[PDB]
Amino acid sequence: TLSLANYLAADSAAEALRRDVRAGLTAAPKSLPPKWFYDAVGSDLFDQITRLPEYYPTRTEAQILRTRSAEIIAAAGADTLVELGSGTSEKTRMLLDAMRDAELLRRFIPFDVDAGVLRSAGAAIGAEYPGIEIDAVCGDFEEHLGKIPHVGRRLVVFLGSTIGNLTPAPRAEFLSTLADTLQPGDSLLLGTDLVKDTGRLVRAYDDAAGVTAAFNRNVLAVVNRELSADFDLDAFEHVAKWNSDEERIEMWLRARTAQHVRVAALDLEVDFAAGEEMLTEVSCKFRPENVVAELAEAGLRQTHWWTDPAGDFGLSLAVRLEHHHH
Template sequence: MTVKHLKILHQHNSSINQTFEKDGDDVIQGLTKSQKSLPPKYFYDDRGSELFEKICDLPEYYPTRTEAWILNEYADEIAAITGSCELVELGSGSSTKTHYLLSAYQKAANSLTEAVPDAFSYIPIDVSGGILKTTVLHLQEKYPDLCLEGLLGTYEEALLYLGKNHGRSRMIFFLGSSIGNFTESESNDFLSKVSHALTKGDYFLLGIDLQKPKEVLEAAYNDSQEVTAAFNLNMLAHLNWRFQGNFDLDLFRHQAIYNEIDHQIEMYLHARSPHQVSLDILDLKIQFQAGESILTEISRKFGLEAVQAQLQSQGLETVKIWTDPQKMFGLVLCQV
């Protein structure tokens, strides 16, 4: 793996790093609240990324295959609307669904009558170095003409790094309804950063999970094989490794419930018995009572009209929306 293909933002860009809080401050803040919580970014060490890829293949977990169907059906149309542009993916993971877009944009680049520098280019961004390296190598082999640079870092680091410094049109995309992991205020802040990394005429493609019956949603996050439970519990293993902790995973159990008032899945880890946990690097000790919970993730479910209004408030005008026939999932293409 060469620097040409992979840039580590949080190590090589100190000016960016200085704008963010000290590593672990969010853990301290979350675990010392009355309702303990942890940011979803701690799901994604290498093991967590592997488990999430397994979740995506589960029979109960409809979002990945449904979004993949939409992309397979409409990728050529998306490429035709935007034209040849620099593709930037936030939270790329294994880039499995992205192949539909890459193939469509490769065809678009090959059809150009005049040569355009880097007409077929892709920037995957992820916080998991292991999966990002594997993805970059695989994509370079599958698409030898692809101009490719992986960015290892958070969304915030990547969007700040990218900024508006691009000489050609750009499309940022955020698939998997990952925006549902943000509160409304957090998603407004995120969309503002996305908008800042785009110039007039650039595009943003957003995947959103649409509102649906409670029983469908809860089954998707409490799968019969308990892969989601392992994914949730792995967050504690990640904290143990990262901050010299002593979480005992056997002392917690996974649960996901659908909050019908706020239209969101809420994922918890419940303490099975009273105990104390230490995170030595953070100089933090946490007491747990039996039944006390840690909120590890929310996953908001959306209505199309509300999403369009929120995007518009951040200067992103909806161009077109695609859904599956059952209207379980949506892709929204918007433009600055």
């Protein structure tokens, strides 16, 4: 059967956006949070990015998961699959199939901000896996991870490389809170994109076809639409950079010429100097030894680590850290 629990108010997304745009556009170094990339148009654009020859991470993680699903499912011994976030719905069915092959599959708990997607995905999954209990939760990572039911033995998965879109401090915060929801017996599956040739990294975030550029610019269309702003999308250049000290990709929008922007819903007048850059996304890249340390600091012990043949990407399986005090 299907059960949906919807914790987001009608104006949750609207109020969150007003705050983020006002905070981002009036900071001395302008920025916009990457989460606003993903309206209908942006999610479609991102979907296309996953099939771009330069953008390897989605396909590499998918290929690792394809190969390791049975082993992940054996390792976890879990009967309940909890999926955190979007865009991983084909990867979801790899894990669900593996759990069904193992005769363990009982419960599926998707957690995402879009209730409509959950209702659709829940009806579909429910049909493809007769007898499964689907407890869908519509909420956000900030506030609602606690709302995920602790029924059964749970494999909690967070795929799609979203973890790297958080800088070290909010990332440490997120992982720790995630770890806190795990009961003994539960496992966390986590994908991390690895440090590699910087040419490859930059091209992945600035493809030859210019799709990533459109995806970046689209966040301006979102602000235009939702807050009645007058960004001139054609006035902003897409810039992807390798930050070697932070070992992360950065995406920027750079004003070709001086721009004056009014966000009418906010009664906010904003100025861009010619060449001024606005930060729209970071994509942190990891070293294998650093993934274990970060997991440890969050209260997790890595029990498995899998990579693709090129060492481009790693999947971790982790469990609650052991403590023996004296």
